[PDB]
Design a protein around this ligand. Structure first.
Ligand code: HEC
Ligand code: HEC
Ligand code: HEC
Ligand code: HEC
Ligand code: HEC
Ligand code: HEC
Ligand code: HEC
Ligand code: HEC
Ligand code: HEC
Ligand code: HEC
Lengths: 444, 443
């Protein structure tokens, strides 16, 4: 209750159950319960570059092409960021924004330096005792009455203002998703001429409540060259990026959203006399016997598990197929640039159109692959996005094949992706392909 | 109800309510309630070739490229086949199979002639007074107890046997199977003179609840007999897919795995301990939603959900349909270049043709299904996604081979759709631009 209290022990003194289950995200999750989200099952780390090998080629040229693991329980958020391969920490102090309760005051005390400083200096702004402290009670609760509060004013509230949302019209069921939307959103780190971070914002420009489309997000990402954060190595393109857009995906006219279901309904199941205790061991619903689903569905865990995986398998199929396709188009751009050096002249108009389409498909495939539900959050929308990804890839592929053939180059029907070179010997730790972790096309 | 009685008036003499709603499918449906299925709304005929202009090109070289309308009420079943453009009636006597209660007896009495005869001779097998009689009570009920019975043995039960299904099937199964007597895809194998030999459901190597588009395509490819028409733009001899509602709905869809039957949504019920079932079978968007019987959301919420899904599925269908039309036009360009002596890589041509078929049959499977994705949303999208993929593979291959042969391929292929949508058939059917169902996510 007292002002200035970050210490979760003070908050949990009168809330022992919530305090205990909150701590319990430290526990390893049960193995063999989820098909696609196995992070920290039996303590294992899951390498997304080994589950989805094409991203090892597509994300090559910055941190995401070196180390990129499945997510774990909340308590590890700072620790896992501490041990991630240093390539990912090139984003600097901006990377504290959704990880430590110190982020708001540090942003407000350092100004632009908060984002632009090195990650190490950023962590050293935090007291040593608190430098591994993950999301705490104060991050989603106000200390006067408890009850949901958006701590992340400088990101989520600013984005909501961009959308024209009236904060005085936000219900508690809204906040039962908005407290997660403080971090389970896609973001942009604008960079200056030295490629140093200037801000963190959610690219919700020109979007409305319940309608943050991938089309709108892409249009914002394209709108400014400060929004180019990395260079794709295989293509040499300076590109923007999309990260874990759970809130944008789920709230975009999905079935459960339109039914009024909040993140917490599925991820914070409750136990009830008149006194309510919500489970704060936030995890995959597949891994706590669907206890949240069963508060509105009277079906067995077996029935619900079947519904989820039936949907995820179709979506994962399209994701993998469009992913190999986009990697093929990247390899085709590599060929194009190697032919340009060898004097072959390429039609500038077909090249420009292919590049535009390739970006459209890439950002679509990335929106899906970055999202942590494998389509279950918004099934048909996810498929729509992947379908367009598939479309745009084809457009780019065909264009490059024509233009290259018009310049006299022989384009093989099968482009070799050489994924072994991208999946292995990654970074300082020389991370290797783990073939047992590959999530193969369920319909291939 | 006496034996040998097809007359539905005799059947409904003691079941007047069901008889009355059964008759009422003659009523025009209300305008402005459905987005995608508007057949006979206010008495209007909706031309699918004007709703989806690309299919006018893709289906060209037989009847589906001349006249192909949205479906309407059951009573008009025979009448609409009578007035359809004769190009579609070239299927012959086989086309009686899902339209007359006389079909089983005509099949058992005529043998192969039942399928091979002309449509006119087939209709002349029926008494003139009954020649416009659509699906009747005997087609779904036995006359001793009114229990649900499968009239179409020579089609549906044979397909069920092919699947290993033991008919000794619950009543909730038959609350979909009486619809699967006709709301399925079929194959009409042809002989050397293009004469119809049979009607069967290509469910080979499929299982109950798992009749995939992949299984269907593999069966259709398995025999030449199954080439029923020649696609004009490409010159390819092709198989076909028709209204696969049962295959689409029952392939591990949300409602299917929840145990919902066709009749749960399409024959809503209302009396003490007994049930009166609505036989004015129509779009649920058009009778204020049947849905209410397991859902506590408003009809507005349900309408919104349905059209939200349909808009996403229709977008993918429209995009892939234009892509497949483009690939077809590219083959046309390829054949005219070959005729001009230009040499085309046979291995790229072969791969492109195989991919074009894979994409075409997938896009057709969706476009022929009458729910626009709602029967099985993610599966519908998966199929469309794969169509999009295969179309893309064919397009690029053709562009490469054509460019390698020295041909200059425009970036945008002119489809010339107006020559395919207008001046169609005996009625000289024209494009109706007010009926076009444009891409909901387009510009
Ligand atoms: C600066 C550029 C950042 C770095 C470095 C990392 N993050 Fe994040 N983060 C956020 C969420 C909601 C999750 C869980 C969902 C998911 O992982 O997809 C994560 C997860 C991580 C992890 C663990 C997973 C991994 O190995 O990638 C690491 C190592 C990590 N993040 C590093 C949320 C946010 C966020 C909120 C808006 C921001 C600004 C960042 N993350 C930025 C960085
Ligand atoms: C009449 C035409 C309708 C419409 C428009 C909808 N339903 Fe159903 N429904 C039932 C069950 C068990 C589920 C699974 C979810 C759950 O267990 O509660 C659903 C699901 C839906 C959805 C969302 C699913 C989807 O992918 O579309 C929607 C939009 C929907 N329904 C609309 C149960 C039943 C029935 C019980 C016998 C009946 C009848 C219907 N539904 C009919 C309809
Ligand atoms: C967001 C990421 C949260 C963090 C961090 C913590 N809690 Fe929480 N809590 C959250 C939600 C969405 C809810 C549901 C609120 C609702 O109105 O539905 C809760 C609930 C509580 C409650 C209310 C009683 C209950 O339903 O369990 C209490 C007393 C509570 N939480 C305490 C609490 C403590 C002590 C925390 C840190 C240890 C803590 N919460 C973290 C979201 C989030
Ligand atoms: C930022 C401060 C966050 C808030 C608020 C919420 N989450 Fe979170 N989540 C965050 C991170 C950085 C991570 C990864 C942690 C790591 O060490 O890898 C996560 C992880 C999850 C998970 C996945 C893995 C697992 O739990 O086994 C889930 C299911 C999850 N988060 C759900 C969730 C919900 C529903 C939230 C709001 C109510 C929420 N989180 C808040 C960052 C942040
Ligand atoms: C039920 C109706 C849900 C709602 C509402 C939300 N999510 Fe969810 N989530 C759900 C499922 C069935 C799954 C799949 C889990 C599996 O094992 O496959 C997920 C997944 C996630 C994850 C990843 C989980 C993990 O173990 O790594 C995260 C981080 C997540 N969901 C977060 C999240 C947020 C922020 C939501 C609201 C904006 C939300 N979920 C809604 C079910 C449901
Ligand atoms: C109430 C708060 C719910 C929770 C928690 C979960 N679901 Fe749900 N679900 C709910 C509604 C109102 C609806 C609309 C249909 C209806 O019954 O009114 C749904 C829908 C589904 C579906 C089908 C929709 C789709 O995803 O395409 C499934 C397959 C489903 N629900 C399962 C499910 C699971 C596995 C959940 C936990 C992970 C879950 N639901 C949470 C209401 C609520
Ligand atoms: C063959 C004998 C059929 C059986 C058995 C069932 N249906 Fe049917 N249906 C059939 C045809 C040939 C047509 C088109 C009729 C025409 O003149 O165009 C239809 C039409 C429908 C419709 C659309 C109704 C509308 O208002 O447009 C629906 C919704 C429909 N059919 C569903 C349906 C159901 C649920 C069935 C089992 C209960 C069923 N049909 C049986 C052919 C045949
Ligand atoms: C059952 C296996 C059928 C066979 C064999 C044939 N048709 Fe049919 N028809 C069937 C259904 C379920 C429906 C309604 C659904 C739909 O997509 O229309 C129809 C509809 C028609 C229509 C009206 C709609 C239209 O296309 O104009 C006509 C004119 C029609 N059918 C004609 C027709 C012909 C010529 C056939 C022989 C090749 C034929 N049908 C076979 C079910 C079945
Ligand atoms: C609800 C859960 C349904 C089940 C089970 C089945 N169908 Fe259905 N069907 C449903 C909807 C919401 C719609 C959309 C109607 C619209 O106007 O958009 C449909 C569509 C059809 C149609 C075409 C309707 C028309 O007016 O032309 C037909 C012929 C049809 N569905 C048949 C059908 C069959 C044969 C089913 C079982 C195998 C079946 N439907 C299941 C809702 C639901
Ligand atoms: C299939 C396409 C049918 C046709 C043609 C007719 N009926 Fe029907 N009927 C059908 C179904 C799927 C059902 C539901 C059966 C169940 O077990 O739930 C029915 C139901 C009846 C009943 C039972 C009472 C009721 O639920 O309404 C009766 C008495 C009945 N039907 C009579 C009837 C008559 C007289 C018909 C011709 C005019 C007729 N039905 C056509 C499917 C089909």
């Amino acid at each position: 209750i007292p002002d200035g209290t970050i210490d979760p022990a003070v908050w949990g003194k009168n809330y022992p159950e919530e305090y205990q289950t909150w701590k319990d995200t430290a526990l390893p999750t049960p193995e063999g319960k989820s098909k696609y989200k196995k992070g920290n099952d039996g303590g294992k780390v899951y390498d997304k570059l080994s589950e989805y090998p094409f991203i090892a080629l597509l994300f090559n040229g910055w941190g995401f092409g070196i180390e990129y693991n499945e997510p774990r329980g909340h308590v590890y958020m700072m620790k896992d960021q501490k041990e991630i391969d240093p390539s990912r920490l090139k984003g600097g102090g901006a990377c504290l924004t959704c990880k430590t309760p110190y982020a708001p005051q540090l942003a407000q005390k350092q100004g632009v330096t908060y984002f632009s400083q090195s990650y190490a200096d950023a962590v050293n702004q935090i007291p040593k005792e608190h430098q591994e402290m993950g999301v705490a009670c104060i991050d989603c609760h106000n200390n006067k009455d408890m009850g949901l509060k958006i701590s992340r004013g400088f990101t989520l509230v600013k984005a909501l203002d961009k959308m024209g949302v009236d904060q005085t019209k936000l219900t508690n069921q809204d906040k039962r998703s908005l407290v997660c939307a403080q971090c389970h959103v896609t973001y942009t780190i604008p960079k200056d001429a030295n490629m140093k971070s200037q801000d963190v914002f959610f690219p919700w420009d020109e979007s409305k409540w319940g309608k943050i489309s991938i089309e709108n997000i892409i249009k914002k990402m394209r709108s400014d060259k400060s929004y180019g954060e990395w260079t794709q190595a295989v293509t040499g393109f300076k590109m923007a990026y999309i990260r874990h857009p759970e809130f944008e995906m789920y709230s975009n006219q999905s079935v459960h959203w339109m039914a009024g279901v909040s993140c917490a309904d599925c991820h914070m199941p409750y136990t009830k006399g008149s006194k309510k205790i919500s489970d704060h061991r936030i995890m995959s619903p597949l891994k706590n016997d669907f206890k949240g689903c069963k508060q509105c569905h009277s079906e067995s865990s077996e029935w619900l598990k079947n519904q989820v995986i039936t949907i995820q398998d179709r979506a994962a199929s399209q994701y993998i197929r469009s992913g190999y396709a986009l990697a093929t188009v990247a390899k085709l751009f590599e060929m194009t640039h190697k032919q340009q050096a060898a004097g072959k002249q390429i039609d500038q108009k077909m090249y420009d159109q292919a590049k535009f389409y390739y970006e459209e498909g890439f950002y679509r495939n990335l929106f899906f692959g970055a999202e942590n539900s494998i389509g279950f959050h918004n099934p048909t929308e996810a498929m729509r996005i992947l379908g367009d990804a598939t479309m745009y890839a084809g457009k780019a592929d065909g264009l490059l094949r024509q233009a290259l053939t018009k310049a006299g180059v022989d384009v093989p029907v099968k482009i070799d992706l050489e994924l072994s070179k991208y999946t292995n010997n990654r970074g300082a730790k020389k991370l290797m392909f783990k073939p047992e972790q590959e999530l193969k096309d369920p319909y291939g």
